[PDB]
UniProtKB/Swiss-Prot annotation, chain B:
Entry function: Catalyzes the conversion of glucosamine-6-phosphate to glucosamine-1-phosphate.
Gene name of the encoded protein: glmM
UniProt-annotated catalytic positions: 98 (phosphoserine intermediate)
One GO cellular component, as annotated: cytosol
Pfam families: PGM_PMM_I, PGM_PMM_II, PGM_PMM_III, PGM_PMM_IV
CC cofactor note: Binds 1 Mg(2+) ion per subunit.
The entry's keywords: Isomerase, Magnesium, Metal-binding, Phosphoprotein
Organism the protein comes from: Bacillus anthracis
UniProt-recorded name of the protein: Phosphoglucosamine mutase
Length: 445, 444
């Protein structure tokens, strides 16, 4: 086992992600990141999870033990930590959370001083520290010990900063929010009220036990019920830690991350704000999003699946907008990580500046009929080389022109191979899948 | 091993690691939690910088057993003990190393009854502290402990200790030295609220400055303050307010022996000093004992340490005990040494008798005594040694009659304690520094 997965260390709080481990991540983490600074400084925030406090105590203790200064942020979104760590001139910032996962889980994610994820080489150096039998690092003593303090102003500094990315205010709109009972439970209702909108809220009553429970971006249907009943203009579903956004138009339909990105780029190009007129998405987003995006002279920059990819691509390209189907969207001009509340602001601003309803804005692309089945392989590298699968693809590839896409490929996350088809008809694309899936199943299942 | 005789002490982050502290939090928590439902532990600290790191680890540890935790912030140790009896928690923890310099911190526990844990409880935490892997329960999800703040706890403590006095303190001018420690905000409110004139020093903890040039083991700057601002009394507390040492109006130090007497005599005068005995360690000076005898007060003497005094008081139902150091116990009110409490009681006599401190202290006479503490690296080796052991021999059979000696390891600090009392300060000091230079030279 390595410890840092695709986005920090996750695991069940007190059973895999133990206080013991959390401390060590703090100490090795602090030491790695603190190393080459006189006056080292780390900020730390979290979502509303029960285990939040147990892990924050360990992480603070571990940080302090290296000599670093800690600033406690309280409950804040993960983008908030990102923003603040760059803006405060901290060396690193830590966010305790497992995002949309259920309460038992937690996680620890670091941003370094430029507001980005740690370099591989730094993460690596941490992991090797977690590997040694004995801790033989510095033990600063007496008056060389780390100092801690509260920086609860942070959240609102953050708030003021995103708030002012808006044109005029939101008056005349009714906006419903679902804050997943997580990090945005108090921030997002504040922010939208400050912006003069009428609000109805749900999932804004965290108690420690209830984060993401039948609420939030991955269960937006209850919000969609609220939107219809409260007769609202838009619903906004953030996840546990406020990096994803999923919307609901005024008719009750879910408007996903593709639709959101599409609305943003359309309006950004029209306003001359979309750098080099391109949008970055993983290869995993819908074909209709691609064709829509081109119908408006907007060039598409597609990456491997992961958001590290979308992000690295934005950085190198000098791009400006990118993200995934899931509502993780990056407005790199402002925040250095995806931000649900930030992207929700930009969304509501477009409804406002164009005086058009969400169903309309969203309906200016048309998503293709999709179908995705993950099948449980038994080592991908062989199936990736498996002649019968490789040709079952070739056969459906030959069938469509088109006028269709097939996408089959695993990861390292869950071990499984992900067959996915898109065609103008549901029937066809169900049919290519059921096919490609029979072959995989019989050959590797 | 880990458990000294008064918590677990060490220099923060070198011997008292946050790792160790986490364990003490979890294992202790567990041992103290097992036999209750909805379990609850409170936790307070002095002003040492390392207090926060250690709190972080302790709270982690406690939360991980499922216990609920209430954070007190900076508060004196007797306060931790008062509240853990009062708020009906199963334990109170205090993070402090008393009068020690900054590097040092310590962790002391209090039980449901506000007393220090049974040797049986202490032994079992110890016995878990040794175990190979921990197979203690790890509650997950919604069984995890919640934390919250109880930062009014201090005021509740102050309310209590307040009413233990006969009348207000008006027309008295009181100087305080709070050792830049746990009493910093507590003490000044407390006395001010009893309508007294207040001057302060050592009330600006920056986290680095506890006991440093201030507080009860360094009362002189205070002594000057009292004289400078024409005070009626000076009161120096220690880092965590378990000690008091005072200054009379003329600027003379009034130590623990002198306080115990001033209180002892008055308690006796007012028929409220149990069995007319005072418990002390065998460290108090002749003049102390001799002024307790004149006055028909029975002196009861233990071996050295707070543990031994409390036990004695506990067993014989006595209600006033303490040490020369100013660690004084008024059992009727509070379940541990309490500096500020002693203060109130003392200031109380002054006010009730209409007497100034010099004449209260002056009732008893200090005989010549010196205790010098050598800063050493192995108590063990130290005492059983060739260049030290013998000197002691030669001196002893010289005072006869007619003087005395007590040389011994500490139990909680890295020092040896050398003490003599004799018929003159001159011989007394000579007896000691003779040994000292030697310890100083032999054992680092």
């Amino acid at each position: 086992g390595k410890y840092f997965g695709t986005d920090g260390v996750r695991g069940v709080a007190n059973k895999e992600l133990t206080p013991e481990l959390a401390f060590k991540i703090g100490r090795f983490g602090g030491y790695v990141l603190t190393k080459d600074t006189d006056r080292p400084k780390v900020i730390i925030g979290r979502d509303t999870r029960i285990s939040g406090h147990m892990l924050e105590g360990a992480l603070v203790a571990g940080l302090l033990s290296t000599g670093a200064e800690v600033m406690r942020l309280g409950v804040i979104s993960t983008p908030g930590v990102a923003y603040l760590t760059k803006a405060l001139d901290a060396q690193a910032g830590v966010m305790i959370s497992a995002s949309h996962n259920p309460v038992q889980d937690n996680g620890i994610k670091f941003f370094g001083s430029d507001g980005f994820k740690l370099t591989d080489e730094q993460e690596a150096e941490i992991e090797a520290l977690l590997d040694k039998e004995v801790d033989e690092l510095p033990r600063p003593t007496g008056t060389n010990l780390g100092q801690v303090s509260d920086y609860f102003e942070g959240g609102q500094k953050y708030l003021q900063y995103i708030k002012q990315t808006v044109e005029e205010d939101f008056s005349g709109l009714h906006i419903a929010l679902d804050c997943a009972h997580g990090a945005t439970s108090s921030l997002a209702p504040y922010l939208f009220a400050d912006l003069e909108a009428d609000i109805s809220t749900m999932g804004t009553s965290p108690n420690g036990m209830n984060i993401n429970d039948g609420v939030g971006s991955t269960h937006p249907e209850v919000l969609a019920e609220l939107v219809k009943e409260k007769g609202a203009d838009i619903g906004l579903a953030f996840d546990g830690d406020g990096d994803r956004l999923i919307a609901v138009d005024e008719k009750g339909n879910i408007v996903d991350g593709d639709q959101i990105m599409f609305i943003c780029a359309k309006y950004m190009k029209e306003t001359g704000q979309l750098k080099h007129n391109t949008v970055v998405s993983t290869v995993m987003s819908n074909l209709g999003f691609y064709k829509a995006l081109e119908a408006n002279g907007i060039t598409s920059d597609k990456t491997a699946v992961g958001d590290r990819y979308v992000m690295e691509e934005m950085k190198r390209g000098g791009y400006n907008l990118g993200g995934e189907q899931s509502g993780h969207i990056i407005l790199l001009d402002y925040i250095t990580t995806g931000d649900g509340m930030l992207s929700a602001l930009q969304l509501v601003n477009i409804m406002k500046m164009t005086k058009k309803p969400l169903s309309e804005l969203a309906g200016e692309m048309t998503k293709f009929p999709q179908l995705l089945v993950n099948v449980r392989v038994t080592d991908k590298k062989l199936a990736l080389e498996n002649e019968k699968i490789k040709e079952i693809i070739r056969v459906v590839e030959e069938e469509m022109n088109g006028d269709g896409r097939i996408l089959v490929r695993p990861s390292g996350t869950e071990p499984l191979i992900r067959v996915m088809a898109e065609a103008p008809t549901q029937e066809v694309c169900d049919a290519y899948v059921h096919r490609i899936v029979e072959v995989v199943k019989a050959e590797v299942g």
